[PDB]
């Protein structure tokens, strides 16, 4: 369609990274289902034009977007890396998602860059300076009502040059089977076959085969519920390329490993109700006690390398989760009871207005994986060890607050906490305050050692954020954000946005100052300033908004609606 | 102290037999919703059945978002926040169509050194949010029944 294909309106910006930048987009309507865009993007500091090529398509298999940015040469990169033969900088991105015939599921989420510092240098459209790695996943699945089989490959390109070694599943096969009316029981089988490879040639390679049948008995009432579950786990490991690790580690990895473990879970819930006439006529309160006993025997897993198992966060919902680690390389032994309670409030219209939850995990015996390298602040092993609380209050139609807190007695401090209060009259009129916390002890326990020794990581998180959005005269829209780290008493990210919207066009002006990197030569943070100017033509489409939500998501800490 | 055992079913009596309809019947959200309805003793029908006066539950758009909630001193992601938004609707055949929603909030810390591990964690979290998004929707069924009686 040569009538609908042509040049768009050029936009511009001034950045501290690349000085004056100039885009010259060109839209191309190949078909009613496939469209393309070619953008010369001239950067003055690098003194060159990088070519952006974007391609959207809709097919039977689903909808997808491809993107390819190429910069033949770069003066700044050449100066910073004299030894390299070429200074070309490229990015490839591909995101495809679809379900065909309701049974086939196709997913692609692939990103590749030429160098780890790509996103610190160029704008964040399909990536961000906040990411520590690039993700490359392919997955093809077949899913019917009682079955699904998925084959997938996952690879990761790690940016930080501390330890660029990263494991990949090439490929991973997942099979699930379900039965529901075998007597009074429900049954399922989970199978998996995976092959772990590493970027380095001296690290162990593995092939894992896992089988997991579970059978459960649910019983339910109007006021109570109790579900019993017996699970079985059988894993087989074949590990090769072990000379390096065994020659350097005192514990020895084994070539063939068999790990067989039962698991027993008993979950119970009750509901009590009461009438709360003092609040308002018709309001009711509900009390919901919940308990769960979990038992998993102890198997010593020191002879297995940890390929894909990481510590799981324990919010209130995660208190009743039956796993300590993700993946399958570390199944912690368990002899524990989780007790929690949830209170809910309903009005005369039976609408939830407020809910609060608190719970804890009591360990009868210490949870052991055979190896235990977690650095705790004390030697607590049994007892009430983990506490978690959650709350959500819908104060009115335009107000709402959320909160969550996690306490670990082994850290001798609050592990993490978060809170947020938001006023939102409408998508253009809104104010939000939020706070995030993470203790240095939590960072020490759940993250590698150089995080505990590095200045930019060791102090944890203490972050306060404010977001505001206000229209004027139905034509203007002012948007602002500010994030402040109280630990360092330093700005983290600030944004400003002004958009003038008319019948035929919209003019957007945006400024942003963000944390862009770390300079270790004298050990400070590195900030980036960006002021942008963009015009887009209206009327051709049905969109008539003020663009507030678009500018609210333009910064490295995007706004999220919390009612 | 005023408390009593809940004497009413979580799912209203008129909704004990219903039709579950979606554009992704074999997806994970549909499986979670069907399992939750089965746990509550709800009889699920196919959309081609001839039984009338049966309320229908049509599931709609599902959006999952992963954003950066906090950053380290170097500007790298520390905490990821994942958002699940589910929009569904309930058609009471004689009366009217009532729309309902669910929003689920979860968080997890990043670790570039264990990226593969983190990915699995993410998957597990998503599998949980679906379940968290299902109970939320059933919990809004009594509100629909109350709105039906009012009008």
């Amino acid at each position: 369609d040569k009538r609908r294909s042509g040049f768009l309106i050029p936009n511009a910006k001034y950045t501290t990274t690349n000085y004056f930048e100039f885009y010259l987009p060109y839209y191309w309507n190949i078909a009613p289902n496939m469209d393309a865009t070619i953008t010369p993007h001239y950067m003055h500091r690098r003194g060159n034009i990088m070519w952006e090529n974007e391609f959207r398509y809709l097919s039977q298999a689903g909808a997808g977007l491809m993107e390819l940015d190429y910069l033949p040469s770069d003066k700044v990169y050449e100066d910073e890396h004299p030894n390299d033969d070429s200074s070309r900088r490229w990015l490839f991105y591909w995101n495809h998602s679809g379900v065909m015939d309701q049974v086939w599921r196709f997913n692609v989420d692939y990103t590749k860059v030429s160098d780890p510092s790509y996103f610190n240098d160029f704008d964040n459209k399909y990536g961000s300076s906040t990411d520590g790695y690039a993700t490359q996943k392919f997955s093809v699945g077949y899913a019917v009502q009682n079955f699904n089989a998925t084959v997938s490959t996952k690879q990761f390109q790690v940016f930080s040059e501390q330890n660029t070694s990263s494991y990949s599943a090439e490929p991973q096969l997942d099979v699930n089977y379900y039965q529901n009316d075998v007597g009074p029981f429900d049954t399922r089988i989970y199978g998996q076959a995976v092959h772990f490879v590493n970027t380095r040639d001296d690290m162990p390679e593995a092939t894992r085969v896992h089988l997991e049948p579970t059978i459960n008995l649910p019983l339910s009432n109007n006021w109570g519920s109790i579900n019993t579950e017996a699970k079985f786990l059988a894993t087989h490991y074949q590990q090769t390329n072990l000379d390096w690790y065994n020659s350097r580690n005192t514990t020895k990895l084994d070539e063939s490993v068999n790990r067989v473990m039962p698991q027993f879970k008993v979950d119970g819930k009750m509901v009590f109700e009461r009438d709360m006439e003092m609040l308002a006529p018709g309001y009711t309160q509900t009390l919901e006690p919940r308990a769960q006993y979990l038992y998993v025997p102890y198997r010593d897993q020191s002879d297995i390398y940890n390929y894909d198992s990481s510590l799981l966060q324990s919010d209130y919902s995660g208190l009743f989760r039956d796993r300590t680690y993700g993946g399958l390389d570390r199944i912690a032994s368990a002899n524990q009871v989780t007790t929690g309670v949830t209170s809910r409030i309903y009005d005369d219209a039976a609408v939830e207005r407020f809910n609060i939850s608190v719970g804890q995990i009591y360990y009868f015996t210490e949870s052991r994986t055979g190896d235990d390298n977690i650095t705790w602040e004390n030697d607590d092993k049994t007892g009430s060890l983990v506490w978690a609380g959650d709350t959500y209050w819908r104060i009115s139609e335009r107000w709402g607050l959320r909160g969550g807190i996690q306490y670990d007695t082994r850290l001798d401090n609050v592990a993490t906490s978060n809170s947020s209060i938001e006023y939102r009259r409408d998508e253009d009129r809104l104010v939000q305050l939020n706070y995030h916390y993470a203790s240095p002890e939590y960072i020490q326990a759940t993250l590698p050692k150089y995080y505990s020794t590095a200045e930019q990581y060791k102090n944890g998180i203490s972050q306060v954020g404010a977001v505001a959005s206000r229209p004027i005269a139905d034509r203007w829209s002012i948007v602002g954000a500010y994030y402040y780290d109280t630990n360092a008493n330093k700005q983290a990210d600030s944004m400003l946005g002004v958009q003038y919207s008319s019948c035929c066009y919209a003019i957007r002006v945006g400024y942003e100052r963000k944390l862009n990197g770390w300079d270790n030569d004298k050990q400070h943070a590195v900030y980036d300033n960006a002021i942008g100017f963009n015009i887009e033509l209206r009327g051709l489409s049905s969109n008539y908004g003020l663009g507030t939500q678009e500018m609210l998501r333009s910064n490295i800490l995007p706004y999220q609606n919390t009612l | 102290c005023g408390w009593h055992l809940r004497d009413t079913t979580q799912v209203p009596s008129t909704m004990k037999v219903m039709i579950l309809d979606s554009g992704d019947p074999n997806g994970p959200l549909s499986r979670a919703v069907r399992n939750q309805l089965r746990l509550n003793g709800v009889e699920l029908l196919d959309k081609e059945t001839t039984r009338k006066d049966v309320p229908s539950l049509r599931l709609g758009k599902v959006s999952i978002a992963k954003d950066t909630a906090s950053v380290f001193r170097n500007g790298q992601t520390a905490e990821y926040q994942m958002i699940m938004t589910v929009n569904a609707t309930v058609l009471i055949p004689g009366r009217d169509i009532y729309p309902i929603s669910a929003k689920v909030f979860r968080s997890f810390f990043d670790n570039p050194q264990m990226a593969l591990a983190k990915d699995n964690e993410q998957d597990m979290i998503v599998k949980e949010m679906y379940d968290r998004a299902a109970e939320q929707l059933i919990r809004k069924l009594p509100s629909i029944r109350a709105a039906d009686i009012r009008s």
Partner: peptide, 15 residues
Amino acid sequence: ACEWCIFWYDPKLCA
């Protein structure tokens, strides 16, 4: 409209 009745309420306290 006492909101703090959520964490403490007893019927015979009222009457």
